[PDB]
Amino acid sequence: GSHMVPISFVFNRFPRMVRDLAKKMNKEVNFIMRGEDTELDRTFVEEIGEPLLHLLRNAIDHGIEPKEERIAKGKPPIGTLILSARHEGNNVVIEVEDDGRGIDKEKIIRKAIEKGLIDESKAATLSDQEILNFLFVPGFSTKGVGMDVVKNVVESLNGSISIESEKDKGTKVTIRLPLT
Amino acid sequence: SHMVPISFVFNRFPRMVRDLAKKMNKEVNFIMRGEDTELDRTFVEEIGEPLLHLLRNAIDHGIEPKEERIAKGKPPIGTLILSARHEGNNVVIEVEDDGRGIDKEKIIRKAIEKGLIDESKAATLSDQEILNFLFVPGFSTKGVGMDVVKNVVESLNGSISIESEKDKGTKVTIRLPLT
Ligand SMILES: Nc1ncnc2c1ncn2[C@@H]1O[C@H](COP(=O)(O)OP(=O)(O)NP(=O)(O)O)[C@@H](O)[C@H]1O
Ligand SMILES: Nc1ncnc2c1ncn2[C@@H]1O[C@H](COP(=O)(O)OP(=O)(O)NP(=O)(O)O)[C@@H](O)[C@H]1O
Numbered sequence: 001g002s003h004m005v006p007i008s009f010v011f012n013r014f015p016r017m018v019r020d021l022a023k024k025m026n027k028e029v030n031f032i033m034r035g036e037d038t039e040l041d042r043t044f045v046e047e048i049g050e051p052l053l054h055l056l057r058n059a060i061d062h063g064i065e066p067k068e069e070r071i072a073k074g075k076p077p078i079g080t081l082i083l084s085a086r087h088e089g090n091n092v093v094i095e096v097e098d099d100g101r102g103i104d105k106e107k108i109i110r111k112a113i114e115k116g117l118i119d120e121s122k123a124a125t126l127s128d129q130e131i132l133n134f135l136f137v138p139g140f141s142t143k144g145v146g147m148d149v150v151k152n153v154v155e156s157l158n159g160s161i162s163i164e165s166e167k168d169k170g171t172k173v174t175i176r177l178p179l180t
Numbered sequence: 181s182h183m184v185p186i187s188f189v190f191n192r193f194p195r196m197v198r199d200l201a202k203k204m205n206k207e208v209n210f211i212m213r214g215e216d217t218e219l220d221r222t223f224v225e226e227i228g229e230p231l232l233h234l235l236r237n238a239i240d241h242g243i244e245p246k247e248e249r250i251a252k253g254k255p256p257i258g259t260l261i262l263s264a265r266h267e268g269n270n271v272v273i274e275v276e277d278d279g280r281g282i283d284k285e286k287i288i289r290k291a292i293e294k295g296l297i298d299e300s301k302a303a304t305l306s307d308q309e310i311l312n313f314l315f316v317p318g319f320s321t322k323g324v325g326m327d328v329v330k331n332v333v334e335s336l337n338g339s340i341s342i343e344s345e346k347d348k349g350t351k352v353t354i355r356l357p358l359t
């Protein structure tokens with residue numbers, strides 16, 4: 001830990017950015033930030049901004065549903081978006097979690113069958129992790145930003161990123177950064 | 181009798197980039213984008229060598245060794261991005277790295293040595309006048325150099341431009357006509 005700085009140097013600029021993205025996409029979202037005092041290498045702080053912003057925009061765009069939809073679906077009217085940082089052994093863990101509609105895994109499945117990557121029979125055997133990983137295959141999604149770009153930036157930092165989601169329950173993206 | 185995906189050009193690069201970076205002991209995350217982008221089939225064989233040369237330049241002269249990336253406060257692993265797309269009536273091909281960038285001082289020194297410029301004119305050269313020296317035929321040592329890349333690009337009736345910032349990186353853009 002030579003050049004450690006609180007992750008607040010990258011976090012504090014998000015509340016305003018989230019609020020304006022919500023207004024633009026007509027989404028009502030309660031934004032929560034946890035662990036802004038978590039220390040990490042300054043190089044990361046200066047490079048993780050683009051990535052996080054993209055995960056936050058994804059949550060607001062594809063995740064949280066318009067209030068009128070959440071209401072019709074029987075969910076808390078206002079959406080919740082949580083950006084947090086914490087320590088797990090010699091790793092700094094940053095997470096972006098929403099209680100939105102969740103990643104549409106069938107949509108992914110159909111796209112993979114369409115690109116000839118898998119056939120029907122095979123698609124019925126895939127695990128959620130295998131499905132969600134298609135989101136990291138370059139060129140898989142239609143646009144440059146994207147999950148492709150988030151994984152590459154994160155890994156150029158010797159970091160790791162994972163995803164998990166449950167239909168109508170929400171989505172959570174996890175980024176692990178190394179202790180320097 | 182016309183278009184084919186640029187993948188016929190891009191396919192062999194990952195392996196050559198991995199092998200190249202490994203030989204010069206550089207950490208490189210190679211990213212290829214838009215390989216489905218189409219271009220005239222008569223460009224395939226001619227744009228290959230020039231493109232490989234730009235990647236080799238990035239790995240060799242661009243991306244710095246780990247300890248050097250670390251001292252500069254940069255991501256440990258260098259990023260080399262090759263991308264193709266259709267913008268207008270042409271195909272756009274970009275080769276960008278987040279390395280140390282082109283040593284402009286060194287280019288000016290070579291320019292003077294090659295009689296391309298007097299030293300009295302070096303002090304006020306713009307970054308574009310400097311970088312353009314690389315396009316002057318006979319500038320590079322030997323083989324292919326930036327001068328040969330520009331010539332091949334010209335023979336395809338397209339254009340090329342360079343952009344570079346010290347310690348930030350270099351981006352080479354090639355625009356080729358579609359029809
Ligand atoms: N938080 C989320 N909640 C629900 N779906 C998500 C979320 N994040 C991503 N997705 C889905 O995953 C697919 C890909 O995300 P991504 O690679 O960021 O692409 P993009 O949003 O489609 N377009 P681009 O704007 O070019 O990145 C999205 O298109 C959504 O279908
Ligand atoms: N991506 C780059 N990053 C930093 N410097 C670069 C890059 N590309 C080129 N250069 C510099 O620009 C000068 C010329 O490149 P070029 O015209 O390709 O010649 P070359 O290096 O002499 N040929 P070779 O030895 O055949 O690879 C180089 O000598 C480098 O110092």
Ligand SMILES: [Mn+2]
Nearest residue numbers: 058145146147
């Ligand atoms: Mn996106």
Ligand SMILES: [Mn+2]
Nearest residue numbers: 236237325326
């Ligand atoms: Mn060279």
